[PDB]
Design a binder for these strands. Sequence first.
RNA 1: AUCGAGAGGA
Lengths: 160, 773, 196, 133, 264, 65, 183, 43, 114, 86
Amino acid sequence: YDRKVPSPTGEYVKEPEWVLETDGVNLSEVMTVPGIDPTRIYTNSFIDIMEVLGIEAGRAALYKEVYNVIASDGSYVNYRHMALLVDVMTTQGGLTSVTRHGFNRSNTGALMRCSFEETVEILFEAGASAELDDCRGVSENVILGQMAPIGTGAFDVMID
Amino acid sequence: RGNLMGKRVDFSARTVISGDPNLELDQVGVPKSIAKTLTYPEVVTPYNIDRLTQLVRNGPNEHPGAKYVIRDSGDRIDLRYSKRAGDIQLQYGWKVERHIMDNDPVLFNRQPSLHKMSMMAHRVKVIPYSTFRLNLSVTSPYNADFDGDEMNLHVPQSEETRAELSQLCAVPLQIVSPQSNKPCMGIVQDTLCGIRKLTLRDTFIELDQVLNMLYWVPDWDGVIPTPAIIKPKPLWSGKQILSVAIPNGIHLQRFDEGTTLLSPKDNGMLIIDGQIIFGVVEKKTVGSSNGGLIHVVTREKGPQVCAKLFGNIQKVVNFWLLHNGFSTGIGDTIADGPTMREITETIAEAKKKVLDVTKEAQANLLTAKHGMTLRESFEDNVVRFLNEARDKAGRLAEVNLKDLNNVKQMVMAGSKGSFINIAQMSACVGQQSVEGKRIAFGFVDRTLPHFSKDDYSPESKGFVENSYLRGLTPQEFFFHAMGGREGLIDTAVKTAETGYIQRRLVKALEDIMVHYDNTTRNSLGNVIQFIYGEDGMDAAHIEKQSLDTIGGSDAAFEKRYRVDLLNTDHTLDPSLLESGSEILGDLKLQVLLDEEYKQLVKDRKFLREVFVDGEANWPLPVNIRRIIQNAQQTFHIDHTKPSDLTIKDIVLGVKDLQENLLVLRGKNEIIQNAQRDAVTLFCCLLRSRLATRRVLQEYRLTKQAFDWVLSNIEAQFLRSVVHPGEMVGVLAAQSIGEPATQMTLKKVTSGVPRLKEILNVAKNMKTPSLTVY
Amino acid sequence: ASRHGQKGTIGITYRREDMPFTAEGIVPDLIINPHAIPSRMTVAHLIECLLSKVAALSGNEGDASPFTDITVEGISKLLREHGYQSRGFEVMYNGHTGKKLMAQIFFGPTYYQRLRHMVDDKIHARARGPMQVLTRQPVEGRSRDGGLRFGEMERDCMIAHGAASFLKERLMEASDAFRVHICGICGLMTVIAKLN
Amino acid sequence: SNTLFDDIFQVSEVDPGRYNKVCRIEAASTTQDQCKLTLDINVELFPVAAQDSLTVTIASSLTRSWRPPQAGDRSLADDYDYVMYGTAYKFEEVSKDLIAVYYSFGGLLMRLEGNYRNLNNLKQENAYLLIRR
Amino acid sequence: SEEGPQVKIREASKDNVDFILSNVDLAMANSLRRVMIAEIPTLAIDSVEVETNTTVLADEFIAHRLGLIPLQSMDIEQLEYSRDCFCEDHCDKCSVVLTLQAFGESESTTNVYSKDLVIVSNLMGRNIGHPIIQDKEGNGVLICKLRKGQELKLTCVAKKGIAKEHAKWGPAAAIEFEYDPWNKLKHTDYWYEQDSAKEWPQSKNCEYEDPPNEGDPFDYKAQADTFYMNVESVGSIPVDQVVVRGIDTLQKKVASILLALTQM
Amino acid sequence: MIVPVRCFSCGKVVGDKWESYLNLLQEDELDEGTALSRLGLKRYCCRRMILTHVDLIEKFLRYNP
Amino acid sequence: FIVEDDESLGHKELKVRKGHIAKLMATEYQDVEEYTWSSLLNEGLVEYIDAEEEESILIAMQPEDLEPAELDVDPAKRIRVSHHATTFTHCEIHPSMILGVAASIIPFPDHNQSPRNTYQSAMGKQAMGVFLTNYNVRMDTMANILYYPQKPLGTTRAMEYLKFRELPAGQNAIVAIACYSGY
Amino acid sequence: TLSHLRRTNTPIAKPRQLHNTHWGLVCPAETPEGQACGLVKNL
Amino acid sequence: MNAPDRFELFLLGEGESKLKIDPDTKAPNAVVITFEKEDHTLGNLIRAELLNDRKVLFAAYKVEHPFFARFKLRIQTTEGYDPKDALKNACNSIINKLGALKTNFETEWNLQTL
Amino acid sequence: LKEKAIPKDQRATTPYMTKYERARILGTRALQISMNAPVFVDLEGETDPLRIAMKELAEKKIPLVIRRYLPDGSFEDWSVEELIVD
RNA sequence: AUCGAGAGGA
Ligand SMILES: [Mg+2]
Ligand SMILES: [Zn+2]
Ligand SMILES: [Zn+2]
């Protein structure tokens, strides 16, 4: 992998390093093997990385994988956007998918949830729940036609 | 999902779009029929009563007119049919639905609608003909081309809405993209090509053309630039007129390849005070990439100056290109006979190598590759040989192509064209790939019914030796057709998948906004980020800059950043500072210098810990180099005289600067520590940029110059901080989506399906892999 | 569009005097940008211009059949016998100035075809229009004077831009704004209301 | 209002470069070892041949919009064959006791090095370059 | 001859005149060619009313054809533009009225020519509105071809106009222009695979100009005072009249500028 | 459908030449280009209008109504 | 076309032969004893092949590849690999027959990339033209017909069978590839 | 009209991709674009 | 539909002034003249003859859009020389050259015999 | 919640006007100006309501108080005069 | 109205 490390002089110099690439993943067994650096090892699969090393390592691996796809395209997207997506899946202890399983299943919001997918079932479950929608979500205000709490609508302007 | 989230809207129009070089970037050319059809309610005011009365008199049929008049009672009055249409007298408080007029805010939208850039406010200009007119540079954010593409225009109906469109959604404001921290719009197509041909030293402009070009710049100083050559003839370099187009006080430094100060290749670019010193304008200077003139003009002066620069550059370059002309032609695709022979013998030697490897495989004298079937190794070797042959033939063609070759001109300018297109038209189009493989035997052991059974030769397997100019054999054409068909299928499937992905991401992140406490939160108040981006700053205004402490040899870092008042050799030369003679000894000032050096060393260790690669350039708030250059140009120090700054003043001022900035205002220990974490990297950058030895060596900044630089750095950081209320989640989702739409699909899942696994957090993975170190 | 996959939209119409002219006085019926050609790799369009120039001067029909060995060098030789350049570049003069153009320009008879889509049929503009009864929303299509649809993606773009008022105005004032009466005791619009 | 530098220069070599109109010129000071020059010139306006000896002058003056000469009574400041106008992009010192001046004349770059000049030379945006045959 | 421009004619024909312009600025020659294409007045059909059309061709198609048909315009200066005339729709001095009636009486398909078009409006002693036939047979341009049992009855109103309004009113078809044939001025750089002389043929206009000398340096002052042009006329206005009217129209435009200045 | 009146590019009348061109090529078995040269269209802008033209008017005339 | 040896251990030959071509051309000229495509099929000179039948056979693209081959070459001609094939069951009538009608319209499609050819095959459907001679008699819902249709200057040999020359759908414009005024 | 008359429709492992068996029986390049690209073929 | 009429390009309408003279800003003698319903043909010749006059420092050539026919001329002259006078003298010289060309061509045609 | 007042001295919101805040203030002032509002700044050659609003913002004349809101619900009220525009 | 077919852009 022709890695680059500080030279004894100080300038960054590149030395080739031997790297193993495995078609399979058994991370717990692999990391506890002599002759490898357990800190350096990285997995294609982020779910296993989080399960062995905690939510934060999985967060880092998720950002790295999204960076890998964007670099395969060659396009660059700023760190904050991808990081926000990964933090959205990361703040909940288990990894939360962008599919309806996950964010739409997450209890926050009622009509905002039904906008994405499974609209009628979400409304049915809300009626059985007798849950209260705060209407603070942008989507819920869009259905309501009330001015959405966008940045322009967030603050309240009154007379002197 | 449909009618409540997205509604058919009144005051909406759609037209086929065409492009006009003369129309300004912020403007849209709205047809007179559309302007007459669409109306905005304007309340009658004492200021507008004359104008509004004239518009109502002019009537719906002719613009500027007015279709309807709304009473205080609100009952409609139709101007098309009424007995009173002639004799209306305006009453205060009435609302006249005026026709859409020039220099008004509207919204121009492209139907893919992947980005906020795809919906941008434009200034109306009423045009005679029927097609919506837009500037060339605005095509890129819209992903628009004049192939019959249609675009929609929406008209605000309230004054607050008009203010929002003008103050936030305007095109000049949206030039700098939050994502990718780069301008969206750059000089494109002919202008780009033309500008390079204008910037060549061989290109010179005569006095009549100079006068006309000077006039073409809508804002002209009126001072004829002094000709580059005077006595033989008053010739003018295209650089001089182009500089008249560049706004004054703007300085750019670009070094590429062998960027000698003498710059014989005319590579790189130095612009001082809007005057170009050296270089031929290529794409990267006039392009959407970071460090281009667009970004510098947008930050230094403002968005308005940048858009006006777009317009002026376009006008001058289009005029000159119109008088020079351009034409691709058949002959620019053709290549010299000797080069064609070299290409053919290159392909022949590749075929001979492939045959030899095939014979080696037949003899079973093929070395075992671990984890790779021997046939897999054979396939990889043949594929690599054919790819290298095609690329090498392309290199021969590119070297063969003269500097006059128009395709080469377009590639050098960067307008359109690539090396692979040159290779395919000139020498060899290469080997077609289906499903990531060479063309398989659909017929049993035969790729095509003409080919013999069990033939693995490249011609049977699909490699097309012939170039596009040479013409393609029928078998080659069928293999190419298979490849192209797979390309079309992949394109459509990709677009569908990215559409679903974008909707998922937007719906997931739509709630996220930067609150007034600077914590990124959802609707329920759950925090996604305590500090947005972990630096608390908007994605715009950030440019990648070099951190000088990281990298380099330790001795070189000491040489650049260490000055010791005690050792004479270490002590700065007395010419640099008036106190330098006084500064010898002065042990207390030296211990302050030692403190600054210890801070720099700790920072170097810290940055080396942050990045194992230790790449010097990372996205940072304020570009110090631009501020330093502006200071040097503003104060005009001869640099022979010693600096007014004292050594203690530099260290103390840098420390006070670092103290002053707060991402979060409050004086709370948790908040203070979070802010210090937020600005730690920026503080390290500032320490690298301004060291006492550096401040007296890289320049002879006066005390007032250092103070001005400090104040400007602080102000630029404060401007760069993210505005509260910004819906970052939607921007993030779009920022992922648009490259993903552009995204197209060593044996690893890549592109859209890999993104689908990541986003779905699906347990099954097509290619699990572990990287053991 | 050309016969080789080059589609186009008429940006402008130019009088013959303004248009660039060859020494013979021939003016292009159509002007295409060079920049389009490199990415498409449509060499055959250029070959068609060359071959059709040769055919027009010779008066003999030219064969563009695929898988027939025809040399661009041979066509160039025929053009050279005609006197026109082998590449088909012709020296042109700028129309407005009469100055000789610095670069010679490829000039040729190219077969071009008129596509069905025409602008005047495509244009639609609605300020106020009929509304579908159930939706109370603008109808669909130009023929019904039906408004354009603010997409869900368009709403997302507007959230990204941050203009709440414009999104609200397109959302309610532009389409299906309605006033209803509800009661405090039950959050349902069961209250009957005589305003007079 | 007086020239900052005057000299006789013998061209070591001429390099056309890629451009056919503009050639780069490598020359040395005649009778002085210290100055050496490399300049971008146009052949079409004035021809430069190898081993030619050319008189080189730099003058500060002789803003205002360039005026075509109103009358022949307005006096040329030079009988020199070539005159150019430009601004220096950086003044540098090659080494202690050696100074090099880098001037861009409408993108045509000219570097000439020698110690004694930098007291004469100034960081001045104005420059008039005079070449005599 | 006279101080200023001097013109030497290479060849004279009724259809075409080849001439050489000396002591002329290039902008002037460009302006003259543009005026010759556009600004010269000419008479062509601007209105068509058809009573009976049994032809396979539609009426609009035939009307466009009729507009393109040349009509003699030597005396066009006496005729007045419709916009200048005070007539409600047409005036005899303003417009010339043509009538054309053709029936397919023969089983063999009968042609319709410009010779069949005849003029109802009074000539008033001016050479205006005559259909123009350069054909050896004297058969006019073929508007339509009529089957047996097919008739066509139409009335045309022809009005004064210029080519900038519509291409049919243009007197001249092609203007041939050549200057700096040896490329001494080097206004253009030739595209050559190996050598410019081999790739680009020598123009006929080169031989009249003196051959360039390889040792002679390129001169930057030189603007070509010599231009080689050829004018080709449709026949509505004679070639000499075409170029003279171009000159005079440019003079009138300049005089209009001058009188506008005096009014200011 | 019928012969164009004039060539679109420059404007030389081409309606008169069609009958004589067809008759020339039939009478003399002439090459089409030589026939155009006798006709007088020396530029391909004029030559395309005669050479590439199709008289669909004959096919329309064949229809009885 | 069917390929069998003219003599056993003589050069394999396409079963059709010049005299048969002359009889076909003579029958086509009458527009004697008729000589049809069905006549060729009954003579056994040509055969119909299903894809499953195509799998078992070996066919040759060009009839000139078949004749025995025992120096200099024009550089512009496409590189043709020597067939090196002992046995050919059949020979293709012409490779261009693999292309459809819309592709047959496309000029020099070999020299062009395939996706552009696909785009043009759709756009040709979209393009205007005189669809039928009886259009004036007919009353279609929508009909677009060119004023002065012009036959293409560059024609495929398949166009004569396509009747595109007889009923063209485009005009031979004079086109310059140039940058003028940026529009 | 002629191409509309020679049209194939395949209702619906890789049918869209051009196949070797399609040589000489289906046009290599004539197909709809976007949706049903290669599902519909022209003889 | 939307397209302007052809009669508009060579006719002045609504009482449009053929020449609009306005003093130029930031240049002492410079003046902008907007020629209305005028094309490139007149403008290039006027600009060339204006450049021929010694006292004119500057003379320009602008069309703001090809859709509309307005030719913009900026003229800057020597002090004591009215730019209007410069344009008038240039126009008069154009007329003299055109008349001389007409006379010479007429003589040549009278010499021509065919 | 209710009477969640924030002391004037103890306000932590950004002194710089948010771009949304400036946009809404300018739009509301322009809307009221269209409806015959009094103009507190002397105007020279200005009829557009938005231009009057921007000039008034420069003069800091607009008597509008923006209620900065927090996730907790406590409100910090800033006058237009107090917020710096940059 | 519904359903279907086709087409346009990516
Ligand atoms: Mg498109
Ligand atoms: Zn109730
Ligand atoms: Zn012509």
